[PDB]
Amino acid sequence: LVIPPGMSEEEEALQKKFMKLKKKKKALMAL
Amino acid sequence: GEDDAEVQQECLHKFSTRDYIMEPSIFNTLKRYFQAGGSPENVIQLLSENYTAVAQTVNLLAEWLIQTGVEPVQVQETVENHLKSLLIKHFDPRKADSIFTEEGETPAWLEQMIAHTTWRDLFYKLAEAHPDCLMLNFTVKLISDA
Amino acid sequence: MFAGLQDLGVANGEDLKETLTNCTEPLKAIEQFQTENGVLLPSLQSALPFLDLHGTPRLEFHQSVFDELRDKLLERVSAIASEGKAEERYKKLEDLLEKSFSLVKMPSLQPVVMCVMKHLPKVPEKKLKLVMADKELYRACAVEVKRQIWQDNQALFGDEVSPLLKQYILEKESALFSTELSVLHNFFSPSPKTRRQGEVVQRLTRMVGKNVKLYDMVLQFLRTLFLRTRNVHYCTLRAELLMSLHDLDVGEICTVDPCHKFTWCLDACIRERFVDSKRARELQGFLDGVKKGQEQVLGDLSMILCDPFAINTLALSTVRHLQELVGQETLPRDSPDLLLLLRLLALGQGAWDMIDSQVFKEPKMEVELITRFLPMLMSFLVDDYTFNVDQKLPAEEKAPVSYPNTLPESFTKFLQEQRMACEVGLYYVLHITKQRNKNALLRLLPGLVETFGDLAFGDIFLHLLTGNLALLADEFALEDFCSSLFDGFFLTASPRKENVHRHALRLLIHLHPRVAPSKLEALQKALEPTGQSGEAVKELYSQLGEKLEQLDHR
């Protein structure tokens, strides 16, 4: 069950795409 | 002119039917066959090839039933009621009266049937369904006169 | 009308013949035969004249007696088998078997003998072997008797179950290659309860009855054939069998197969095409409840998970958790439900490796599949979500966003080196096709060209992929979509793998009108029978021929 606690490259990319999508959906919401 | 080849095949037909060796008519049929000049060798073939022993097969079923615990007199009563059922279905008064005019004396089997009480019941049930038949009125009187 | 009569001292037709032949007094012989072989009831002798006088044949009297008495005796055998104390019960029926069995080939009496064996838990083995020796006795006797034969002649059992297996496997192949291409219904559409009504699995259920020993033999057959052929459909049948006895409440088997509760739980998930959290956690407990020293039940839990219907439900469930982890903005490592599906899925996909060389350990879970591969999968989702919203936004200006058509090299490496990464990637491809996401599909199709174990060319994935590709049937007019699927994917493997040849032709036949005619003719040439090919692709290539000449009348 052992995983290193730091995030991998692909994980941080995922979290970046997550935030990129949050912004887009907020901007879509208003304008 | 002569019948001979028609009669022959009329007889060979009966010889082919199931268990014809058991039939009372077989003696009459064999005489018709030979008076019409029938060769005999293939008659033994037909009678034995078409023997199934239905009647012996009834004996077997009866003893099997009895061995499994049926009371014997009860298998006997089923068998007797089947004879009784057939006789009531096909009862012809003219045939019965023929028993009488074929000989003034009665046949031996009539006085023997009467000793069994199931056969007397059959004659009583016959005497109602056909009240104005002569052979039954005679038979009921024979029973009474006992 | 047969020889067995002599066994009981009763004359038959040959006895009659020898009696009449060369008889010095034939008519006397006949009249004696008549009295010795009639119904032996003295009270009849006086009344039979009365019947003779009416011309009624003795045969009609004897036959009608025989019908009643025979039916009464059949009824009595049923009565004796559900009555009284056991040893009196079966003693009467055994005695009747010893009497009547020598008459078993007489047509009129064979039903009596059959019925008596039918109601005897332990027909004596002498009788059983005499039944087994004669083909028409054996074939025309009750399954209660057959089970007693099968229980002690495995090879005969096997000869009975082999043609049923053969039919089953052929039906599964016909179903994956039926030219019924549809997004409404496909191979995985019928419920477990529906599938368990099929004629092979019902016949196998009837052959087994409640006999644990027959059930073990059927398990053994399926294991052997699974090992020898690697055909995963034998796993479905092992599940369907145990579940059939479950629905018939056959406790004599279900309470002693340690995979029973597992299979029952897994069967509900299959019916919903989803493993919810509760049944997942129950599956986990059966897994964790494998006691040391009985580790080979792992092999059998694996086989039941190797059920394609089970695989399909786990993969569908995995792809659903990714989809709703994107909405929750959570990484795979932080979803315990997801790790559980992966554990079950890995076992199913490893079943044959386990049975092969009996190492009964759960497979090692690859850390990087959870931290690197599944994250790249969800990125493709988030990408596609971002593209959708990028279009609903104004002032595209310069660079109206181009759909990302890039595959990280590490992705395809996982696809070509890891059973489980390949599998869930395949199902993520099945998902976007079903969504007719032409952009996502064209992005992922490259890099399906080389996959672990040629999994992207398996019959199951290709049956579902081509079925889902009907939802995109119009796109086949454009030729770079057409060549992306044929030249970029199918024709990659169609010369080397026969079934890919078959699937490709089966997709063309379904899509023939929508495909640009000059491309149709080119594809037709590229899919010609290679001379060393089998009957199936030859008949399919012919079907193309007639459809392409019938379309020319428009």
What distances in angstroms separate CA C182 from CA C102, C464, C484, one per listed residue? 60, 9, 21
Q: DSSP characters for C480-505?
A: HHHHHHIIIIIHHHTTT-HHHHHHHH
> What is the domain count for chain C?
4
The DSSP secondary-structure symbol of C364 reads: P
Q: Identify whether C305 is part of a domain.
A: yes
Q: Identify whether C395 is part of a domain.
A: no
Q: Do B57 and C43 touch (CB under 8 A)?
A: no
Choose the final residue of a domain: C257, C290, C310.
Answer: C257
Number of residues assigned to chain C: 554
Is residue C207 within 8 A of residue C147, CB to CB? The reply is: yes
What distances in angstroms separate CA C27 from CA B31, B32, B126, C31, C374, one per listed residue? 10, 14, 35, 6, 101
Q: Identify whether C18 is part of a domain.
A: yes
Domains of chain B, residue spans:
4-49, 91-144
Considering only CB atoms, which chain C residues are within 8 Å of A10? Answer: 371-373, 375-376, 379, 408, 410
Is residue B96 within 8 A of residue B136, CB to CB? The reply is: yes
Rounded Cα distance between B44 and C271, Å, is 72
Rounded Cα distance between C412 and C393, Å, is 32
Which residue from C536, C469, C461, C538 is spatially nearest to C507, judged by alpha carbons?
C469
Same domain, C28 and C52: no
Same domain, C262 and C235: no
Q: Identify whether C28 is part of a domain.
A: yes
Rounded Cα distance between C64 and C285, Å, is 66
Pull the structure tokens for residue B28: 């009459």
Q: Identify whether C426 is part of a domain.
A: no
C155 Cα to chain B: minimum distance (Å): 36
C453 Cα to chain A: minimum distance (Å): 25
Resolution of the deposited coordinates, in angstroms? Answer: 2.7
Q: CB within 8 A of C5, min separation 6: which ones?
A: B53, B56, C11, C12, C103, C106
Chains touching A, CB cut-off 8 Å, 3+ pairs: C
Note down the domain range covering C103.
Answer: 43-123
In what helix (H) or strand (E) does residue C379 lie, and over which residues does it extend? helix C374-391
Experimental method: X-ray
Residue type, B77: E
Q: CB within 8 A of C134, min separation 6: which ones?
A: C105
Burial call C244-278: b when 16+ CB within 10 Å, e when fewer: bbbebebeebbeebebbbbbebbbebbeeeebeee
Q: Identify whether C549 is part of a domain.
A: no
Look up tokens 């290709």; give the residue: C462
Helix spans in C82-153 (H): 86-100, 110-118, 125-133, 135-139, 143-150
Q: Identify whether C240 is part of a domain.
A: yes
Q: DSSP characters for A1-31?
A: ----SSPPHHHHHHHHHHHHHHHHHHHHHH-
Q: Do A3 and C372 touch (CB under 8 A)?
A: no
How many CB atoms sit inside 10 A of residue A21's CB? 20
Chain B's closest residue to C3, CA to CA, is B52
Same domain, C361 and C265: yes
Rounded Cα distance between C269 and C264, Å, is 9
Q: DSSP characters for C177-213?
A: S-S---SSS-TT-S-HHHHTTSHHHHHHHHHHTT-HH
What are the DSSP E strand ranges found in C300-426?
none
Residue type, C50: F
Which residue from C159, C171, C256, C245 is spatially nearest to C202, judged by alpha carbons?
C245
Rounded Cα distance between C373 and C533, Å, is 38
**3-class SS of residue C153:** coil
